[PDB]
């Protein structure tokens, strides 16, 4: 496939509401990304761990994909997922990842301290680990504590939206990216695009050009926003649709029928799938020995 894992939802925190112009800009850039050839699109959210989440569990995500972007999915046939990223600065601050991981589909944490880096690599349920590439990374990246979290269900993300914004941030971007590929041995990495407008978007032939210049080869950079991000989506989606990756609430055969490929068919409010009873006990047990589909 072709997948983009980051499109910033315009909002500071749970404090202020969103103006309509930002939403129209989001629609325009979403249509542009579709025009470039992207099938599955994420939508990020940036909150800090040191702030209260609302008590009422229903309002833990205001994206509301099913009824904000219905017509765009009708025409373009796009698939939209929600996502959350949490700022981690100091542990022993409460607000565990129990309920916030319930409403969302992907949970990620970016650390900005030594304690944050220690906490967010061995003893968390996250699936994406990201840094802030427009500043100074908190620690020299140890060669052992990063390669020993890839073997769990965690991956690293590179956002190139910082390489097209200003002049001073480019140096930090280059240095931090070189450090990350050097320390992580370049095994599990995915690429997003924090574009704030249609001008900043790039296609598959114009995202590999930048990254190939910072050390990463071409085939790996193609696999970056390929099946790897699909596996990230799979881990994100197998957390509220199954117990321990053993009993999913999914559907049957036929192309585009999975737990990630099917978004409209599954009633997420009740997590059930009512389907036509077309397969019974008194029918021949083979593919072609029975002919009726």
């Amino acid at each position: 496939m072709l997948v983009d894992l980051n499109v910033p939802w315009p909002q500071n925190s749970y404090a202020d509401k969103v103006t309509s112009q930002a939403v129209n800009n989001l629609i325009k850039t979403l249509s542009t990304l579709h025009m470039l050839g992207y099938t599955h699109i994420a939508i990020n959210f940036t909150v800090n761990h040191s702030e209260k989440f609302p008590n009422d569990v229903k309002l833990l995500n205001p994206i509301d994909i099913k009824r904000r972007f219905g017509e765009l999915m009708d025409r373009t046939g796009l698939k939209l997922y929600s996502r959350i990223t949490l700022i981690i600065d100091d542990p022993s601050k409460g607000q565990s990842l129990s309920k916030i991981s319930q409403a969302f589909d992907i949970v990620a944490a970016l650390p900005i301290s030594e304690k944050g880096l220690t906490l967010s690599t061995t003893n968390l349920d996250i699936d994406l680990l990201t840094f802030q590439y427009g500043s100074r990374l908190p620690t020299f990246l140890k060669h052992k504590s990063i390669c020993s979290c890839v073997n769990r269900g965690v991956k690293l993300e590179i956002v190139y939206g910082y390489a097209l914004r200003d002049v001073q941030a480019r140096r930090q971007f280059v240095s931090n990216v070189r450090s990350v590929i050097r320390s992580s041995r370049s095994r599990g990495i995915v690429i997003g695009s924090g574009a704030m407008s249609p001008l900043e978007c790039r296609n598959i032939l114009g995202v590999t050009s930048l990254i190939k210049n910072l050390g990463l080869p071409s085939d790996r950079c193609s696999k970056a926003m390929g099946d790897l991000a699909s596996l990230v989506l799979l881990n994100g989606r197998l957390r509220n649709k199954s117990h321990k990756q053993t009993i999913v609430t999914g559907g049957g055969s036929g192309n585009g029928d999975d737990v990630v490929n099917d978004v409209q068919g599954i009633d997420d409010v009740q997590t059930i799938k009512v389907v036509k009873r077309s397969m019974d006990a008194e029918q021949l047990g083979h593919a072609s020995k029975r002919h009726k589909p």
């Binding site: 002049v167 480019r170 140096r171 280059v174 240095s175 050097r182 210049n213």
Partner: protein, 169 residues
Amino acid sequence: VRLKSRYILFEIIFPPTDTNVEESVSKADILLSHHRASPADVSIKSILQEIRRSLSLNLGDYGSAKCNSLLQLKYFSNKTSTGIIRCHREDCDLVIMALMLMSKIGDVDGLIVNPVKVSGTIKKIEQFAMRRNSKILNIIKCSQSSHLSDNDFIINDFKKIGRENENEN
């Protein structure tokens, strides 16, 4: 794995480039004239600032950011202008380009920055510097009686730069 490095040993030559001088011709005098000390207005900060200036003009953002990630000035002496700089292994040629395309350090003018050797470990450039100083002292004490160079621009310096600032293991 572990990150590699390269060390560059750079000197500063102050050629006379002035008319109505008619110098003598001999291997001793040329070296004794070109190798005068630095006027002490240059510092450890001036060289670094000037080598950063010469990169973001003769190269762009993607040429001034692949070198500025790791670029540190370790040792510099004024009695003899020798200095040592450190950089990544794969991005050492760009620093050399910065070196040549740069003259007129700070406000001082009419000079040449001369990289003489590049090596991986730090233990070996020390031996190279010692051999270089020994060679210069031998060539300055062989043209004639040595004390005809009595001005002592450099003679008392090579012995006394032994390990005073070179204890950076």
